[PDB]
Amino acid sequence: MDIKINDITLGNNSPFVLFGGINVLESLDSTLQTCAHYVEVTRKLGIPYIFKASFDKANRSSIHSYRGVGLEEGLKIFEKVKAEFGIPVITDVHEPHQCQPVAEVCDVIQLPAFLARQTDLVVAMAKTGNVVNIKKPQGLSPSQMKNIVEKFHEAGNGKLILCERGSSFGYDNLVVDMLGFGVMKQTCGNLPVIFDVTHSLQTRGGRRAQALDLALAGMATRLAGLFLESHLLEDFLIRIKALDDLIKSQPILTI
């Protein structure tokens, strides 16, 4: 099942969409400058692009780390990003009451992994009618994502993206099960599946050569998109796009 996001078609058999930006919104000037780098590299490679940032990050490394500019100013910034670049945007929400005003502006709203089971947030997200990105908890098996999907369906919204971020592997480590993508496709109605390579790695060419190997491996399984929590970018995306074009150009095996 494909999902239309303005002029973008997101789907497991469509060219991959890149989801990328900054961690937290600080200022309009800072945001536009970063977004302009992503936009210029992606436009030049012809890769569809969705800008990501948090306006209010509830899951911070420290208590007093900056949460972001907040709902009101954040949504202003996002409006400016959409107007200047003509691209869709994505942001996370952690409180039910935030969902509706965020959804007036943000094309995709994101369910953080740690809140993925919180029924009230699921419901309030669903009721926006917006495209939703469901982050897979590291403790949830791929065959149980269908239960989160079910709850969104009960609450009236089927425009759902499934985002892999790795699975708990002993202590501390995360491993990404390359079979999980296929399990999610088979059990969740072939909804678009995207890969958050960055998180998948935070606990493991340095990080750069690893991110590339892991992104390649995941995209080889035929996925709707790639999600980075962030010329260097350009070399990376050239390789991802090469693999993605090859894979998507071949028909799926046939019974």
Q: Which is nearer to a copy of itself, 29 or 254 (CB)?
A: 254
Closest separation in Å from C-beta 95 to a copy of itself: 8
Given the complex with Cl ion, which of 113 and 188 has the nearer CB atom?
Answer: 113
Measured from the CB atom, the residue of 86 and 139 that comes closer to a copy of itself is: 139
Distance CA 106, CA 100 (A): 10
State yes or no: residue 118 binds Cl ion (CB under 5 A).
Answer: no
Closer residue to Cl ion in complex, CB, 41/87:
87
CA count, 13 A, side-chain hemisphere, 99: 20
Give CA–CA dist 81/84, Å, rounded: 5
Instruction: Between 21 and 137, name the residue whose CB sits nearer to a copy of itself.
Output: 137
Q: Of a copy of itself, Cl ion, none, which one does residue 62 interact with (CB within 5 to 8 Å by kind)?
A: a copy of itself
Q: Give min distance, CB of 229 to a copy of itself, in A.
A: 15
Sign of CA dihedral 107, 112, 115, 117: positive
200-206-207 Cα angle (round to 5): 20
- Smallest gap, in angstroms, from Cβ of residue 202 to Cl ion? 11
From residue 233, give the alpha-carbon distance in Å to each of 20, 24, 28, 165, 237.
11, 19, 22, 20, 6
Residue of 133, 195, 190 lying closest to 166 (CA atoms): 195
State the binding partner of 103 from a copy of itself, Cl ion, none, CB within 5 to 8 A by kind. Cl ion
Rule CB under 5 A: is residue 113 a binding residue for Cl ion?
yes
Stretch that binds Cl ion, among 75-83, 111-119, 155-163, 241-249 (CB under 5 A): 111-119
Residue closer to a copy of itself, measured from CB, 32 or 243 = 243
User: Given the rule CB under 8 A, which residues bind a copy of itself?
Assistant: 58-64, 67, 94-95, 114-115, 117-120, 122-123, 137-139, 141-144, 147, 150-151, 154-155, 167-173, 175-179, 181-182, 201, 204-205, 208-210, 212-214, 216-222, 235-236, 239, 242-243, 246-247, 250, 253
Please give the sequence-ordered ranges of beta strands (E in DSSP) within 25-62, or none if there are none: 49-54
CB 187 within 8 A of CB 145: yes
Give the residue, chosen from 12, 91, 110, 130, that forms a contact with Cl ion under the rule CB under 5 A. 130
Backbone angles phi, psi at 196, to 5 degrees: -80, 90
Non-local CB neighbours of 4 within 8 Å, separated by 6+ positions: 10
Selected binder of Cl ion within 77, 99, 103, 122 (CB under 5 A): 103
Cα distances (angstroms) measured from residue 51 to each of 32, 81, 253: 10, 8, 33
**Which residues of the chain form contacts with Cl ion (CB under 5 A)?**
103, 113, 130, 137-138
